Design a protein around this ligand. Sequence first.
Ligand code: HEM
Ligand SMILES: c1ccc2[nH]cnc2c1
Ligand SMILES: c1ccc2[nH]cnc2c1
Length: 289
Amino acid sequence: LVHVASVEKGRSYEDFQKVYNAIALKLREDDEYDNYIGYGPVLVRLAWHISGTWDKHDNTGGSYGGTYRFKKEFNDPSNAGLQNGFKFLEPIHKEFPWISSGDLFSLGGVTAVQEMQGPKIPWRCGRVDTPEDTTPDNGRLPDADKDAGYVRTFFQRLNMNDREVVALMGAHALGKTHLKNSGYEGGGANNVFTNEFYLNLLNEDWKLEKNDANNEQWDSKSGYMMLPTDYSLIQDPKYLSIVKEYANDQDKFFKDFSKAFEKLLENGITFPKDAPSPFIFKTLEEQGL
Ligand code: HEM
Ligand SMILES: c1ccc2[nH]cnc2c1
Ligand SMILES: c1ccc2[nH]cnc2c1
């Protein structure tokens, strides 16, 4: 199974920076969502869930086909809550109807990371909408109630190694869990991209508690929480070494996240040799907007 990137007809960097800017301006304006967290974190999660269905063995799933727009994937219980990100993007797709769904969903993730003062994430266009029958079945996204061996094995399906997994998990510095979506009771929340996830893991006094959905989670007296899969990163000796490295080096964490997140968004896609180079979008702040 081969998915060849094909540039939206006649489009170039300027066209995509316009779409970036429309998303970024809406993120600034619609600031009330989720108790003033805004839509940044849910857009990062949406970009990851549309990519995280990929299977390296047969090249099914992944971001290329934009299949989240179809009922089966949209209603995956693992995707509960992402409807809010879809609704946010809807008026943008109406304004720029030439952009493919996979491009728009992945670009939403890149825009959110950058606009939340994260690293620059190079991004390539040319995902092509594929038909309803290409939608992957539910159950390809990970459970949260598991241990380090589960996390490591799960991510091998996405061709991610230990360092890539630890860097990607740093996105759990953003946003929060919601009992009604996932069965985990959210704690203190944030909408600025930092390496704080690793500092919190190492520095807080975590207590294993049961929440109102009868699931276990790790809570601290400061009011933060960790999923069992988050806490597994300090139970496994290989993961723990990398957690310490990112807690102590913000720049390294930014650089490794950027590479791993770009790879996640590109898995399954063949780029022709004459495809354009990846784009690096300017933030609103860099444009004086
Ligand atoms: C073992 C892998 C992972 C598990 C089990 C997991 C699980 C979860 C769960 C249960 C939530 C709460 C959803 C809700 O109740 O609304 C969540 C939130 C989130 N996850 Fe993950 N996650 C994983 C990996 C990742 C990765 C790789 C990223 C991005 C690179 C990511 C980004 C996020 C973000 C941004 C949120 C916040 C969403 C919001 O505030 O609405 N996660 N995760
Ligand atoms: C966001 C919202 C609606 C869409 N329909 C097709 N692609 C979309 C992206
Ligand atoms: C999702 C969102 C925020 C989090 N903080 C700690 N773990 C999390 C998972």
